[PDB]
Every structure is written in C-alpha cells, then in structure tokens.
Specification:
It contains no helices and five strands. The radius of gyration is 12 Å and the shape is globular. Helix content is 0%, strand content 48%. The chain has a three-stranded antiparallel beta sheet, with no helix packed on it. The protein has a two-stranded antiparallel ribbon with strand order 1-2. Disulfide bonds join 3-24, 6-11, 17-42, 46-57, 58-63. Belongs to the three-finger toxin family. Ancestral subfamily. Orphan group II sub-subfamily.
C-alpha cells in the first residue's frame, strides 16, 4: 500500500509500505516548551495511545495523511 509520510507541519511524501504490513500508522507529540515530534510506521493494526499524544492510521491508498 502507498501512504504519504513526512515529519513536518506542511509536507507529505509518498511512500510504499511493501511488507508483511498493510496499513500505515502515524504518531506525533505536541506540548508546551516548544515541543513537536512526529513518527510514522507500517503495520496491520490500529492500536491506541495516551490522551496527550496523537495517533492516526489509514488502510487506503493515499489515505494516510
């Protein structure tokens, strides 16, 4: 499957998650004290996370923002 990935405010680069996985999940953190970090990863499940962090996965082509 193909998904857009790019750890940045305004930016998205197409990627290919060719492997045992199928969907693409993304996780980033945003807090005070000038804090902002993003990280994506291929998988086949959409787990959860803390109420502070942000997580989002997609199971469609060009879906994963």
């Amino acid at each position: 499957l193909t998904c857009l990935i790019c750890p940045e405010k305004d930016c998205q680069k197409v990627h290919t998650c060719r492997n045992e996985e199928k969907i693409c999940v993304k996780r980033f953190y945003d807090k005070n004290q000038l804090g902002w970090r993003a990280q994506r990863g291929c998988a086949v499940s959409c787990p959860k996370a803390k109420p502070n962090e942000t997580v989002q996965c997609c199971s469609t082509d060009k879906c994963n923002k």
